[PDB]
Amino acid sequence: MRIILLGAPGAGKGTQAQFIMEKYGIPQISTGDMLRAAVKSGSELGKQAKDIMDAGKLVTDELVIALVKERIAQEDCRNGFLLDGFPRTIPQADAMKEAGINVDYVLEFDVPDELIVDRIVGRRVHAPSGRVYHVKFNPPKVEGKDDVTGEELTTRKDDQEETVRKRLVEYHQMTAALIGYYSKEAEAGNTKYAKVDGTKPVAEVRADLEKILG
Ligand SMILES: Nc1ncnc2c1ncn2[C@@H]1O[C@H](COP(=O)(O)OP(=O)(O)OP(=O)(O)OP(=O)(O)OP(=O)(O)OC[C@H]2O[C@@H](n3cnc4c(N)ncnc43)[C@H](O)[C@@H]2O)[C@@H](O)[C@H]1O
Ligand SMILES: [Mg+2]
Ligand code: NA
């Protein structure tokens, strides 16, 4: 199974990705996670993203296309994968088409703009795994600690309010058009498309997605 997650910043894509990965045993391909990891490790492919992400801007198409192409060539992607943050622009989507990368589901996470800032400012992450928490809405069992590894959670450098607002502008300017893109693909029978209410509690969004994915 191959899946794309669409939605504004903070819509809950990464949170729900964890559950989908487990049930269907496919890896999460998170371009945000991959870019942050490249910056942290000083990897030649992706370290350039540091200043761009801090500015709340999109990394160039060619860089993230290269990162994704490298990542889905791995053997753990041979029987399916979950795309989380990719594609993020029309050219990124067309690059997938050009490469002949078909998907089975495109899942849109709907959340009002007014909820995004207070979600992201409370976000805490376990970088090695991609797991994320919220200090109020979805906290760890032990404050500041990853539930699975017990390792110390961190705060992303680009998660302050002003940077979030810039990300939201970028989204509406560049990324929202992917709804129509994959809605059109679905009408052609090239994939299924489904929209969920991302304001529901985490477990209910999970249940709604499970009902769609069967
Ligand atoms: N293809 C690409 N092309 C170009 N540039 C790219 C790129 N991909 C990345 N980049 C670059 O990387 C930068 C950062 O991008 P990115 O890594 O994607 O961060 P983002 O834009 O802020 O949005 P996320 O996808 O991380 O949020 P999410 O939808 O996964 O929600 P989450 O589960 O975390 O949840 C949010 C919070 O709410 C909580 N939460 C989750 N679900 C619920 C719920 N139902 N109820 C209450 N709280 C919830 C969570 O605990 C969490 O705290 C970009 O600006 C860009 O520079
Ligand atoms: Mg994500
Ligand atoms: Na398909």
Residue numbers in the entry: 1 to 214
Extract from the study:
AdK catalysis, which plays a vital role in cellular energy homeostasis by catalysing the reversible magnesium-dependent formation of ADP from AMP and ATP10, is dependent on distinct ATP- and AMP-binding subdomains (ATPlid and AMPbd). The turnover rate of AdK is limited by product release, and it has been shown that the microscopic step accountable for this slow release is the re-opening of the substrate-binding subdomains. AdK populates two main structural ground states: an open substrate-free state and a closed Ap5a-bound state. The ground state structures of the P177A and Y171W variants in their apo- and Ap5a-bound states were determined by X-ray crystallography.
The Pro177 to Ala (P177A) mutation was chosen because proline at position 177 is conserved in AdK11 and introduces a kink in helix 9 whose importance in the enzyme's opening/closing dynamics has been demonstrated by all-atom molecular dynamics (MD) simulations. P1,P5-di(adenosine-5′)pentaphosphate (Ap5a) consists of one ATP and one AMP molecule bridged by a phosphoryl group, and is a good structural mimic of the enzyme's two native substrates. The apo and holo structures of both variant enzymes are very similar to that of the wild type with only minor differences in the conformations of their AMPbd and ATPlid domains. The catalytic cycles of the two AdK mutants are thus supported by the same underlying structural framework as that of the wild-type enzyme. When bound to Ap5a, the NMR spectra of the wild type and P177A variant of AdK feature a single set of resonances because the structural interconversions of their bound states are rapid on the NMR timescale. To assess the accuracy of these measurements, we also determined the diffusion coefficients of the P177A mutant, which were almost identical to those of the wild type. While no similarly pronounced change in the rate constant was observed for the P177A variant, this mutation is significant because subsequent analyses showed that both, this amino-acid replacement and the Y171W variant, redistribute the native energy landscape of AdK (see the section kcat versus kM and kcat versus KD compensation).
